[PDB]
Amino acid sequence: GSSGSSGMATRSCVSRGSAGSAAAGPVEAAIRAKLEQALSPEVLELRNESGGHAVPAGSETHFRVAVVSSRFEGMSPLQRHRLVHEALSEELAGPVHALAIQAKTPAQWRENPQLDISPPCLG
Template identity: 35%
Template sequence: MFDPNEVKRLIEQGLPCEFVAIEGDDGTHFTGIVVSAAFEGKLPVRQHQAVYATLGTLMGNEIHALQLQTYTPAKWETVRGELGL
């Protein structure tokens, strides 16, 4: 079982991020928001794959699901007020 803070740490360690928030209360299913300049020019599926890559073999094993919202810094500036963050 994984702690959301450990998932967050691994993502931040593997990807340059401006903001990461991960939640989950059962240790295997998580939701999160990741903001990174590395997402510029990438389709959402490629953005998600970049995040999953930071977690390696944990995805599909110890981490059963990670529902993501990914944003570039510019898009995040627009969206974060709508999300109340």
């Protein structure tokens, strides 16, 4: 068992219908990885909400992101989203249909760095 050689997965996975393992996904990650280099805020939080309507697991239409950059320093509430939306225009125009984007500043975050994407239902 020496490394170097070129192996291969070679393993039938098989899984159709409902798939959504591991936290986040390739879409969400991007939404972040993007804004990450498309804004490079001080605090970029993102997670899967999928809670409200009557949709089965896997639905990645509703999302919540928390961006913390100075870009939105005394800016409009629309512009903020626009900025992101602009970077991830395909997101809002494809998979994501409506995601609550949190546009804050590195000055305000400090005040209330506590987000609110979910209720206090922890244990």
